[PDB]
Write a protein that binds this ligand. Structure first.
Ligand SMILES: *[C@@H]1O[C@H](CO)[C@@H](O[C@@H]2O[C@H](CO)[C@@H](O[C@@H]3O[C@H](CO)[C@@H](O)[C@H](O)[C@H]3NC(C)=O)[C@H](O)[C@H]2NC(C)=O)[C@H](O)[C@H]1NC(C)=O
Ligand SMILES: *[C@@H]1O[C@H](CO)[C@@H](O[C@@H]2O[C@H](CO)[C@@H](O[C@@H]3O[C@H](CO)[C@@H](O)[C@H](O)[C@H]3NC(C)=O)[C@H](O)[C@H]2NC(C)=O)[C@H](O)[C@H]1NC(C)=O
Ligand SMILES: *[C@@H]1O[C@H](CO)[C@@H](O[C@@H]2O[C@H](CO)[C@@H](O[C@@H]3O[C@H](CO)[C@@H](O)[C@H](O)[C@H]3NC(C)=O)[C@H](O)[C@H]2NC(C)=O)[C@H](O)[C@H]1NC(C)=O
Ligand SMILES: *[C@@H]1O[C@H](CO)[C@@H](O[C@@H]2O[C@H](CO)[C@@H](O)[C@H](O)[C@H]2NC(C)=O)[C@H](O)[C@H]1NC(C)=O
Ligand SMILES: *[C@@H]1O[C@H](CO)[C@@H](O[C@@H]2O[C@H](CO)[C@@H](O)[C@H](O)[C@H]2NC(C)=O)[C@H](O)[C@H]1NC(C)=O
Ligand SMILES: *[C@@H]1O[C@H](CO)[C@@H](O[C@@H]2O[C@H](CO)[C@@H](O)[C@H](O)[C@H]2NC(C)=O)[C@H](O)[C@H]1NC(C)=O
Ligand SMILES: *[C@@H]1O[C@H](CO)[C@@H](O[C@@H]2O[C@H](CO)[C@@H](O)[C@H](O)[C@H]2NC(C)=O)[C@H](O)[C@H]1NC(C)=O
Ligand SMILES: *[C@@H]1O[C@H](CO)[C@@H](O[C@@H]2O[C@H](CO)[C@@H](O)[C@H](O)[C@H]2NC(C)=O)[C@H](O)[C@H]1NC(C)=O
Ligand SMILES: *[C@@H]1O[C@H](CO)[C@@H](O[C@@H]2O[C@H](CO)[C@@H](O)[C@H](O)[C@H]2NC(C)=O)[C@H](O)[C@H]1NC(C)=O
Ligand code: NAG
Ligand code: NAG
Ligand code: ILE
Ligand code: ZN
Length: 902
């Protein structure tokens, strides 16, 4: 055997019943500058199988328990063996209690300990967060257990399936508020040893996982509402934030979201209250702790005076996301981290459903397509991708567990679940989902359990018919990586699938059980009329008259891109879609108008259509009003801009884009009443934002005039910003671009005296838009000055300067030169040499720039690269790729743009 304390997974011989946990953070340093917390815990557990060893998680805890590190008692009239010794095994993060005899099956035991650890500013376990309020540095105590950090706060059986009830007490300064998962039992009472402290006890949690515990000590205040069923809702934030009203939007949407989900899941919200809390600089973004959800401030707070519509969208969807988890994930918990994708994928999908309930005029459900589908297809169309599923026995270490939290798990998980709900129909999906939640409430599952309950719902009805079982179908989408391109020859109705890769020369080495064949749900529209639904079975090719066209007719597959795949056609069918898009675009769903664009640029990249065909798919845009298709274009073209914006190709590119966007600019000019009022709904606001951005950055004089007029206006009356927050990033940037040191120095002043992050970020990025070398160089001169630019903003600012075509050589020169600064900043704080390198080499696309990158790397002797060592190799490979892509494409692209710009 090996010794069980040297294995990463816990024994199954002992299961927890319940914990008492008392934590006391010391928010004042011990004057060698160390912040600590103290804790006491008791865990009651049940012996399942005889064992003479107790193994429990512990991380970075010092034990001050009297005697051994624990005290062990029997519950009721159980005898307990004597402890031999207690030891800490750091590698597997264990406290290990060796006993002189065995525990006995069916008996319960109580294990008591006393302990302390650092209250570090490290965003892990029970930790400190420091922030400014006026003159004073404030410090609060808060938690982040996700994934394996509960054990950093108190000793516990720290695996998601080993659920228990938790009785939490905080000992805290008596003028601070204490929060946890559950409401407080009553009023706080003074600590007898020192009445300057108070004692807050919380009601017993339900049976729950350790990674979902939270407790917070702070000066925060709240806005409150009581839902009609007496569920108390509160948004917590800094006193000044609450006083400004920044908590109101979150409060507004929370009640509707919770209502939606309780109905959606057919399951009552399982707790007496919902707290949500805005934390300054919470780098983890948001965390779904049961009854006490934590957010970074800009994820929860909203200022109507400065915040844009996209800020508003981020808040409502992040809230819907976290709140989804309060049933799916928290009430029913995946047994192990290898199934993380199901949990995060599910929430990443239903976040749109919940938010759509809160904001039902916004069409938010559409945003999953650009937001998750195409986003993850970019990485899932690579040889280096991976399956959704991972065998449980391969996910053991805390590092391995961490690697589960990626794009695939969230965005593809979301995409494939959305696919699943769509082929089942939502009503059927909901039935199976309620069945699953009711059967497994307060317990743990695998994805197989969800498939089973969905199968049950399918089996219980006669109307939806599938080509195989729910499991066999989803096995194709979960056990193998990637996704198919579906190619339709419309002359015959032949239809094929192959594994899609952006690099047509890629060697795939990861094998599939299914030889990279899928079972594929295929919806289709013909001449703008929905056709019967079709399933592509697990074959390379098939035929169906559904996909056979006449010479005037067209067909279009994957309505609303509900299916996780991309579609190619014969050129004839492509041209018919094109003619349709030019003559009456309304016949084709707006999501598909985007699809045509998204897919065809990926297909061109993969050498499956010519690049000119993808470009042809943008021609219809001069009469396109809607957000998504334009966004598809701008997303697909930003690489073209990156490659060509210093070349002869650029002028015709700009001209062409000016041509395309001018009518949209005109359209919004009227709709908005000389730009005085925004469009009403979110999609049209987004379209306006993009139209103005596109117009201005391509040098449409009317947009240039608008941007100079408004920024002139703001400058002559600084306390009244005339520029709507939606339009700010463009109007700032374009105006600093047309302007000199007057405009620059003014925005600089405004950046220094800004109070709000979102607004500081927009000024910082706009300042990089100057066309004066001397301003950009001076500005770079500031980025290393922490008095003028925060370190966490430095590499970002340098990238923004690199982004500017004039700034490219300035940034690149500046990085090379002060690279001698890994040794101040792999020192003082992290930095992200990796993001810096990517941003500043992003453009490189010639042999000459590759020689420079190689010549740069030749400072290998010492210094090195730190967290960008990998990133510098990724730069030399991406340049090689860019060199190749520019030779293959430059001529063809030049002549297209010339020929289509008039
Ligand atoms: C985990 O925490 C629980 C809450 O502290 C403990 O349960 C509490 O035990 C208390 C004392 O042991 C009881 O409070 C009072 O104590 C006096 C002492 O003189 C007793 O007479 C009274 O029974 C009691 N007073 C009242 C008004 O009940 C509580 O009864 C009890 N709290 C409960 C049950 O909610 C657990 O013992 C502790 N677990 C372990 C394993 O130590
Ligand atoms: C958990 O226990 C740890 C092990 O005892 C503590 O870590 C030790 O902290 C010591 C003091 O805080 C450090 O030792 C020396 O401290 C004196 C004065 O404090 C200084 O003169 C010395 O410069 C310093 N020694 C050195 C070699 O730097 C140690 O850094 C450290 N010892 C070890 C073995 O890590 C933790 O502080 C303790 N944590 C909590 C939260 O209680
Ligand atoms: C939380 O929900 C509240 C109620 O749904 C929203 O309150 C609405 O705020 C609107 C924007 O401030 C107000 O609209 C208009 O405000 C201007 C201010 O001068 C007035 O001219 C208009 O008369 C007024 N609108 C109407 C339709 O009369 C609404 O007055 C106000 N609605 C209510 C019921 O009070 C909050 O906006 C919302 N909070 C956030 C941050 O979104
Ligand atoms: C945490 O508190 C709860 C509830 O106050 C305790 O639950 C009690 O458990 C005792 C001992 O098993 C039972 O006799 C009572 O019936 C329980 N009360 C309720 C309302 O469930 C629980 O034991 C505490 N946990 C620990 C570790 O002490
Ligand atoms: C809670 O009590 C503490 C201690 O009296 C207050 O903390 C002091 O606040 C002043 C500013 O008003 C600082 O200059 C001191 O350094 C603070 N002392 C410590 C030990 O940090 C605190 O302001 C009170 N907070 C609330 C919300 O009432
Ligand atoms: C969960 O869904 C079930 C099934 O729709 C709900 O039960 C139905 O509720 C409607 C509401 O008036 C009744 O007309 C039906 O007769 C009920 N059917 C059954 C089988 O009871 C139930 O209300 C939902 N529960 C929750 C907590 O949302
Ligand atoms: C993990 O979840 C399973 C269910 O998926 C739990 O097993 C169930 O336990 C309950 C309560 O004891 C019983 O009603 C069921 O018969 C069990 N179902 C089984 C064994 O398939 C299991 O207890 C959970 N694991 C842990 C460690 O709590
Ligand atoms: C559509 O599919 C059919 C195959 O199902 C193709 O027709 C076959 O082509 C081979 C060529 O050697 C013949 O031997 C078979 O007898 C043909 N089958 C028939 C006529 O039923 C056809 O090429 C495909 N069309 C495409 C891909 O455009
Ligand atoms: C494709 O997506 C569009 C939305 O982009 C869907 O149209 C929505 O349909 C729902 C219910 O049918 C309406 O309540 C919405 O108001 C519609 N929005 C718009 C802007 O039309 C359409 O149903 C989807 N098509 C299919 C076949 O699923
Ligand atoms: C893939 O293998 C073939 C060998 O037949 C080779 O031509 C090609 O260069 C290899 N790799 C890539 C990434 O293209
Ligand atoms: C656009 O197509 C729809 C499809 O029925 C049709 O009703 C409408 O008349 C068309 N619009 C125009 C301007 O012809
Ligand atoms: C700290 C946040 C964690 C990772 C949470 N589960 C999320 O996905 O947002
Ligand atoms: Zn999540």
């Amino acid at each position: 055997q090996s010794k069980p304390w040297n294995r990463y997974r816990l024994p199954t011989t002992l299961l927890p019943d319940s914990y008492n946990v008392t934590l006391r953070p010391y928010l004042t340093p011990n004057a060698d500058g160390l912040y600590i917390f103290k804790g006491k815990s008791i865990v009651r557990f049940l012996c399942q199988e005889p064992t003479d060893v107790i193994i429990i998680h512990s991380k970075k805890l010092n034990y001050t328990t009297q005697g051994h590190m624990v005290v062990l008692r029997g519950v009721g009239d159980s005898q307990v063996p004597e402890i031999d010794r207690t030891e800490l095994v750091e590698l597997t993060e264990y406290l290990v209690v060796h006993l002189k005899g065995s525990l006995q099956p069916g008996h319960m035991y109580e294990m008591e300990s006393e302990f302390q650890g650092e209250l570090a500013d490290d965003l892990a376990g029970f930790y400190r967060s420091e922030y400014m309020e006026g003159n004073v540095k404030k410090v609060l105590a808060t938690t982040q257990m996700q994934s394996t950090d509960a054990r950093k706060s108190f000793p516990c059986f720290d695996e998601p399936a080993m659920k228990a009830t938790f009785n939490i007490t905080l000992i805290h300064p008596n003028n601070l508020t204490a929060l946890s998962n559950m409401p407080p039992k009553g009023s706080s009472t003074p600590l007898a040893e020192d009445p300057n402290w108070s004692v807050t006890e919380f009601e017993t949690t339900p049976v729950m996982s350790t990674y979902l515990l939270a407790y917070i000590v702070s000066e925060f205040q709240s806005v409150n509402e009581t839902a009609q069923n007496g569920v108390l809702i509160r948004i917590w934030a800094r006193p000044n934030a609450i006083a400004e009203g920044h908590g109101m939007y979150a409060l507004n949407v929370t009640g509707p979201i919770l209502n939606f989900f309780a109905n959606h899941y057919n399951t009552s919200y399982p707790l007496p209250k919902s707290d949500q809390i805005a934390l300054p600089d919470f780098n983890a973004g948001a965390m779904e702790n049961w009854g006490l959800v934590t957010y970074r401030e800009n994820a929860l707070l909203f200022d109507p005076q400065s915040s844009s519509i996209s800020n508003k969208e981020r808040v409502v969807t992040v809230i819907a996301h976290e709140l989804a988890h309060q049933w799916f994930g928290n009430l029913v918990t995946l047994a192990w981290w290898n199934d993380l994708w199901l949990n995060e994928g599910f929430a990443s999908y239903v976040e749109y459903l919940g938010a759509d309930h809160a904001e039902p005029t916004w069409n938010l459900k559409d945003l999953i397509v650009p937001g998750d589908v195409y986003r993850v297809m970019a990485v899932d169309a690579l040889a280096s991708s991976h399956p959704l599923t991972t065998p449980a026995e391969e996910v053991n270490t805390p590092a391995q567990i961490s690697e589960m939290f990626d794009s695939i798990s969230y965005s593809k998980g979301a995409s494939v679940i959305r696919m699943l709900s769509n082929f089942l129909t939502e009503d059927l999906f909901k039935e199976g989902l309620a069945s699953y939640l009711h059967a497994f409430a307060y317990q743990n599952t695998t994805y197989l359990d969800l498939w089973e309950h969905l199968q049950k719902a399918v089996d219980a009805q006669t109307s939806i018919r599938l080509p195989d079982t729910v499991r066999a179908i989803m096995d194709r989408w979960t056990l193998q990586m990637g996704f198919p391109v579906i190619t339709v020859d419309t002359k015959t109705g032949n239809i094929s699938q192959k594994h899609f890769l952006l690099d047509s020369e890629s060697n795939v080495t990861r094998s599939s059980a299914f030889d990279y064949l899928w079972i594929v749900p295929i919806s289709s529209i013909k001449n703008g009329v929905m056709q019967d639904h079709y399933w592509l079975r697990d074959v390379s090719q098939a035929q169906n008259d559904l996909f056979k066209t006449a010479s005037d007719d067209w067909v279009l597959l994957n309505v609303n891109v509900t299916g996780y795949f991309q579609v190619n056609y014969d050129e004839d069918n492509w041209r018919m879609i094109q003619h349709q898009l030019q003559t009456n675009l309304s016949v084709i769903p707006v999501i598909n108008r985007a699809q045509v664009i998204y897919d065809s640029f990926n297909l061109a990249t993969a050498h499956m259509v010519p690049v000119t065909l993808a470009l042809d798919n943008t021609l219809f845009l001069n009469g396109e009003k809607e957000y998504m298709p334009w966004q598809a274009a701008l997303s697909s073209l930003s690489y073209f801009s990156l490659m060509f914006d210093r070349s002869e190709v650029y002028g015709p590119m700009k001209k062409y884009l000016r041509k395309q966007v001018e009518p949209l600019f005109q359209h919004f000019e009227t709709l908005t009443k000389n730009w005085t009022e925004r469009p009403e709904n979110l999609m049209d606001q987004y379209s306006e934002i993009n139209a103005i951005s596109t117009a201005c950055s391509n040098g449409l004089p009317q947009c240039e005039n608008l941007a100079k007029t408004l920024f002139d206006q703001w400058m002559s009356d600084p306390e009244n910003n005339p520029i709507h927050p939606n339009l700010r990033s463009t109007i700032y940037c374009n105006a600093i671009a047309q302007g000199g040191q007057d405009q620059w120095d003014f925005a600089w002043g405004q950046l220094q005296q800004a109070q709000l992050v979102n607004e500081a970020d927009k000024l910082r990025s706009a300042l990089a838009c100057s066309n004066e070398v001397w301003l950009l160089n001076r500005y770079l001169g500031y980025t290393l000055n922490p008095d003028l630019i925060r370190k966490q903003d430095a590499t970002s600012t340098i990238n923004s300067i690199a982004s500017n075509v004039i700034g490219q050589p300035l940034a690149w020169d500046f990085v090379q030169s002060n690279w001698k600064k890994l040794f101040q900043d792999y020192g003082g704080g992290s930095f992200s040499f990796s993001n810096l390198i990517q941003g500043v080499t992003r453009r490189f696309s010639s042999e000459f720039e590759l020689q420079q990158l190689e010549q740069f790397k030749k400072n290998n002797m010492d210094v090195g690269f730190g967290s960008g060592t990998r990133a510098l190799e990724q730069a030399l490979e991406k340049t090689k790729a860019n060199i190749k892509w520019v030779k293959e494409n430059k001529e063809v692209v030049l002549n297209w743009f010339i020929e289509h710009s008039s």
